[model samples]
Target: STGSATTTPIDSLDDAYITPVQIGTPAQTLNLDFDTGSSDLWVFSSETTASEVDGQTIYTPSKSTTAKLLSGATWSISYGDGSSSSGDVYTDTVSVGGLTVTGQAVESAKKVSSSFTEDSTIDGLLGLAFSTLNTVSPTQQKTFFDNAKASLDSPVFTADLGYHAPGTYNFGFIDTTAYTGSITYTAVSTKQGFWEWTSTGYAVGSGTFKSTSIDGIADTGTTLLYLPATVVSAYWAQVSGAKSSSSVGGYVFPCSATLPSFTFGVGSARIVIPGDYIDFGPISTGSSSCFGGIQSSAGIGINIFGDVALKAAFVVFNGATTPTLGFASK
Candidate 1:
């Protein structure tokens, strides 16, 4: 649902993108991180261990009048980029952006730990991926989007992620006013249960634009833009001092180096990520060695169009029978 039901992920808490979610009849407003990569809507709840509580807001089904336990049902799910969590299930009147659905499954974690540990209040995840990846055991459940999509004026959602707090996720309607460039769409293949597609090619600096078919997943999961080893190696090779260190985690280079802008094709249109953005920030507080926004998806086995804020690019996840992704730059 991206912003789902008109629910928008309005701000960044720490570094994680989260939106306010209203669950139950009386509204247990949880700030949940929305996931398009997976299909399970799991969260920290009354059943969550105290040790796991940390500072996260807990969803107490007991508090919501309409919250009904999905008896005998259990779910388990894991993500490629982070922790795996699993446990029991419940259903309630869930609302996002203002759009509401009745008896929506809400998987509450009795045991799990996949969220990054920086943010203190990311309560749960509302998955917008295809329902094929759902983990409920007795009988799988539909995603919020799947259930709510039919009611939507149009089975489409838009994502406009921001760095500080300027982003908005929209359901049903595509904000034509959101971007400058006309939308360029590409066919999406969901055989892998993701918004998977191919890019025309990539290029470093202002150099040659390599033309080839690059199959990849367009995920709102992580912030880094992951490409093939051949692609990433091509990117870093241009810099003087660059190395992939597991200690610091992945690639880093001299902060002073003029990194190249990244460009990818979606049909006839091209989006270029700024060169300055290539050097996001430094690991050490005052250090000159900076981290590269681009990463290698070698062992992961899939290139990711990972940075939704790659350029504040407005993206449309068209949910028609034959899904297609629309991209536009502001």
Candidate 2:
């Protein structure tokens, strides 16, 4: 389907983590991940051993009120990061927020890795980010957004990430309360694997942005914003001592300076990411370098607008009916 929400092959884990989804009338739970790179929901079962289950959330079938294993259909998925998982299919009612969906297709992995086997913070990930990577079958791929579109109340499934200490990754209906009457909408480009934009420039200290010919993508699945070396070099040149320390990896700078603001111009719309993001702070190493919020990804092809950038704006994914995004204030 061209504009339909469908599931795709995704990075699956051995642990049975619970992801809440709407199942019929009541709220149900399913296994999923907080994946920002791709968007898909899956789970694991009792057959899954702790050893095979690496860094992932474990979901117990005994814990759920309504759980049904999908007999014989085995599934396997591999990620770009080299992480992979293999398992069987199961059906259960899943819920998120106040919405509940029933008989949703779920995965039950028997083997996983260490990273997925350790963390128990979130039962499973609510992959609300943008990417066509996660899906159901290796060949017949589709995303949660693809499936939810047919059943969602509205045609949209907007996502909001919190900035403060504890932020939530919410799904379902778009919260009108966050918007300022009207939302800026953009058409998704098919060429790029992620959603990207051309920043008009940047705004410094509440002032207008200094224009630059820079282009970047807005990815929620990612944790920070990644920019081209050329763009960053030019950005640092304007602010004296702003460049600070440079590594083969990225740049590190102090947050105290009157840093310049930056925005990627997308035609008339300009997406803004403040300069404070430059400070990644001092790690174990003595070198206090400028955080590479915008670093080099020459080999990666697409630029990501991770949490660092998403925190500045409210993003909406219209998975229900209309496949579009509406950006508004946080």
Candidate 3:
């Protein structure tokens, strides 16, 4: 059977997108962040201590007849943003959109870091990365897509992320109506359990394109686009009054600054990020200072094409042989 799901950004936060998913016999619904950067289906759950839960919804596995304990199995994960969770595992019926998988591994969080516990709206993370990256110990768990791929019409999914608007994460079938222009396909290197690719080059503000190859990952979980230090410096240099502040953590500029368009090369296709999109809102309320949406990937190793960059284009993560990435203007 073929199926798909649509996701929307929470009204309060544009940093992550959430989709409704069902788990267990009675179909308990959980709003989960569809994270391509990770590979573990984890939730704040009954197993979690009451004081540690804060305002988050908790998944009660005991209430489901279909839930079975994966004795001794456990999971723990830490994200680039420092948010983390750790817990035991359970096998239960899990469904996304109309596609369902029996005995899917569900990591129930017994403890969560402040970053996650403080974000009250998000219930869990639905990892879209390869199964190899799953955090379960003793035996690794497969992702929802991995378990359902064999039965899918096509082993492909599309991420249509929008700015302060509803977007979709479609599976099994491509919605031709959602994107315009021919999709430019690029080969992906998945050795790191990520949708990694090399950008042929980039340019700042209508300037001559530089043939600087950038190896990076398409990470929906990350909120900002991170490039090499030199590239980030070059982009910021074009903006007058822009400065890298240790206090702010990244480059910050006046909110009224006339920002320049940023472009990245993807297999001869250049997707441009509008100047307005570069201003990542204000650093504080009633303040003219604004944090940049793009930053340096100094310690992160590989650059991350996060929500800031992905929202500028429609992305296709094709799991077909040799895994490829297809891009087009949204």
TM-scores of all candidate predictions against the true structure: 0.92, 0.73, 0.97
Q: Record all residue pairs in model 1 with backbone atoms less than 3 Å apart, i.e. clashing.
A: 6-97, 7-97, 83-114
Candidate 2, residue 275: lDDT? 63
What lDDT would each prediction earn against the true structure?
Answer: 0.80, 0.52, 0.89
**86-194: candidate 1 lDDT, tens digit per residue:** 8899999888887888989999988767353334657788888889989998999989888888889899978777654446778888888879969999999999899
Give the residue spans of candidate 2 off by over 4 A: 1-33, 43-48, 52-57, 62-65, 80-82, 118-122, 129-132, 138-142, 167-172, 190-217, 238-248, 254-259, 285-287, 320-322
> Which residue segments of model 3 deviate by more than 4 Å?
11-13
RMSD of each: 2.5, 6.6, 1.3
- Model 1 misplaced stretches (Cα beyond 4 Å): 1-14, 114-118, 308-311
Over the full model, what C-alpha lDDT does candidate 3 score relative to the true structure?
Answer: 0.89
Q: Candidate 2: worst 10 consecutive residues by lDDT?
A: 1-10
Alpha carbon deviation, residue 10, candidate 2 (Å): 22
Give me the displacement of residue 210 in model 1, in angstroms: 0.9
Q: Looking at model 1, how many pairs of residues clash?
A: 3
Give lDDT tens digits, candidate 3, residues 1-330. Answer: 566777888654476788899999898999999999999999989989787888777789999999999998989898888778999999999988888889899999999998787788789999998888999998899998888888888998889998878788888888888878878999899899999999998999989999978999999988889999999999999999999999989999988899999999998898998887777778888889989988999978889999888988999999987899988987
Strongest candidate by TM-score: 3
Model 1: how far is 20 from its true place, Å? 0.9
**Candidate 3's TM-score:** 0.97
